Nucleic acid binder design. Structure first.
Ligand SMILES: [Mg+2]
Ligand SMILES: [Mg+2]
Lengths: 227, 225
DNA sequence: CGTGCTGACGTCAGCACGACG
DNA sequence: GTGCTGACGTCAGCACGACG
């Protein structure tokens, strides 16, 4: 019926990095926003046209970190994120190390199981990358026993509530289509995490149902690249 | 002199709890916002009357957690924070436990040293309460080696830019500097951001003051035992 | 009876390039 | 390389009611 059961926690995830998948990129900034199932069900369903941007739930756990990469950012990436290896290193940020894994483990162990990660284009980007960054380490994966889904597929599925042109599923395109405003704090880890949360809160009940149906273990995601 | 060196990181801190010091209160929500020295110094300079609310730095490590207490919130505490033991437990939030200490340790270890906490009224409330919660645990204090200060003291100091009986509550100071109300009132993160704005008013002066007044968190005495 | 139309489904070659930083 | 899409082959379902 439901592989793995009803998800008790969604953790909304977004990464910034040195560049794109060709480039064997490294993670520059990470954000996690953990929301319990109830919290999301209790989102208000008060929708005219346009419906207002849903207000985040009161109760939320959040983690936002900047990470020094082992290589420079592409000029392109450093433009759009507002980050650079020079600046992270003059500010004393660390690499993606075992210590960061211990942090992530403890954050996740505070969330009730089962537990699903949620990232826009996460099947192709955030989950492989993270998997690579984590395999490098001496510790055991903090993400073992955790599940994951991609919000593009979620929102594609959900826009079977209505047929014009074939339309974009980029984070921004979706937000604007649904709420008729520009989103904000673009290409900062937390900012896009909050945008993502807003689009998932559009139809909470339907989303959870779909997450429950399509959730798969993080341990099956294959690394973007190796060594 | 400068008793412990230049502080390389400021961690802005704020708690919500089940009540006030005469209850033996427990922590319900906790936010840490870590900003490097340089990131503070690179804040754009306040000018004009009022000056605009400074924009937070780009580079920031942030932690926000809700925590289930072992006892009920007071009616007053629940109203003002928007949190209640019932709601925290239906949502599966945990106690302040050994695992949370590990978490906090790892967060702090990611910050360059020396490192100072900053809390509004922390000398009387946040630091002792935190000290209390930590002493209950089987682990060592994650805050060994970390320093602390109170922002009420710093902001008193800094407002002898004028030459004079004001209120030094968080909202009073903000309204005084920026002529606006602050926004997400009595949510751990909200008031941390409001605190950061305050501290970004005269970034240089503040860091000077923090360097002179930072003291070890180990010397803070618990609220209760 | 067979014959032969129709609509549903799974497959695959061909085509336009998304969507992450 | 990915990820839609339309063309094609296949198959199950359905309509015929023919005759002495
Ligand atoms: Mg994204
Ligand atoms: Mg306070």
């Amino acid at each position: 019926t439901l592989p793995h059961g009803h998800m008790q926690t969604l953790i909304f995830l977004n990464l910034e990095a040195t560049g794109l998948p060709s480039s064997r990129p490294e993670v520059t900034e990470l954000c996690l926003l953990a929301v319990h199932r109830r919290a999301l069900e209790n989102t208000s369903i008060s929708q005219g046209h346009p419906p207002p941007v849903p207000r985040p739930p009161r109760v939320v756990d959040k983690l936002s970190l900047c990470i020094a990469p082992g290589k420079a950012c592409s000029p392109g990436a450093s433009e759009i994120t507002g980050l650079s290896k020079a600046e992270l290193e003059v500010q004393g940020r660390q690499r993606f190390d075992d210590n960061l894994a211990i942090l992530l483990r403890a954050f996740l162990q505070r969330q009730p199981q089962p537990c699903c990660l949620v990232a826009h284009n996460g099947d192709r980007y955030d989950f492989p990358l993270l998997q690579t960054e984590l395999a490098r380490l001496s510790t055991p994966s903090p993400l073992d026993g955790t599940f994951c889904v991609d919000s593009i597929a979620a929102l594609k599925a959900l826009e079977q509530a209505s047929n014009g042109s074939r339309k974009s599923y980029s984070l921004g395109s979706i937000y604007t289509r649904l709420y008729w405003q520009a989103p904000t704090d673009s290409h900062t880890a937390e900012g896009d995490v909050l945008t993502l949360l807003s689009i998932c809160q559009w139809k909470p009940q339907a989303l959870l149902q779909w997450v429950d149906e399509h959730a798969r273990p993080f341990s099956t995601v294959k690394p973007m690249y190796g060594t």
